[PDB]
């Protein structure tokens, strides 16, 4: 794993130090706190706050009631279609490890070892330079492999 940042604090807002190309990981491992109700990981296009960065990829987990993983992706400051994954293995109090996978079509996104879910690309992800990581979440390291 390359460029690794340690325990950032959050709200992080962070360069990708390169194109996400076919093949490349990125590798999250954080803590969801007792009192989370819900926490994002955003791969964006740059990263202003008005007008709003395009959020190409929003990883957005939930945890009222059973809980779920949202996905969506912001453009022009309006949200599109959600896709909602229910087989949430994310609760609070628990560690965990996301593997975010940049395929050429889709992302490919791994939980905890175990595969979880798939998100076709609505903005082409060579649009991405920037990850964000917002809410209530305790990240312990950020890896990149190109
Ligand atoms: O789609 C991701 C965004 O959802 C926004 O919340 C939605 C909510 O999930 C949906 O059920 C509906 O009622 O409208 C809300 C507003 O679009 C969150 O505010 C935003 O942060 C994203 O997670």
């Given at each position: 794993l390359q460029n690794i940042i340690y325990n950032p604090v959050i709200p992080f807002v962070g360069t990708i130090p390169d194109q996400?190309?076919?093949?490349?990981?990125?590798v999250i491992r954080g803590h969801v706190?007792?009192?989370?109700?819900?926490?994002?990981v955003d791969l964006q296009n740059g990263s202003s706050v008005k007008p709003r960065a395009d959020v190409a990829f929003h990883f957005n987990p939930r945890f009222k009631?059973?809980?779920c993983i949202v996905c969506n992706t912001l453009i022009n400051e309006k949200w599109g279609r959600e896709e909602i994954t229910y087989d949430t293995p994310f609760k609070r109090e628990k560690?965990?490890?996301?593997?975010?996978?940049?395929?050429?079509?889709?992302?490919?996104?791994?939980?905890?070892g175990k595969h979880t879910l798939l998100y076709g690309h609505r903005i082409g992800p060579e649009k991405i330079d920037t990850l964000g990581i917002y809410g209530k979440v305790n990240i312990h390291s950020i890896?990149?492999?190109?």
């Open positions: 996400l190309d076919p093949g490349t990981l990125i706190p007792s009192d989370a109700d819900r926490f994002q009631r059973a809980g560690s965990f490890e996301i593997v975010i996978m940049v395929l050429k079509d889709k992302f490919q996104v791994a939980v905890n890896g990149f492999s190109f």
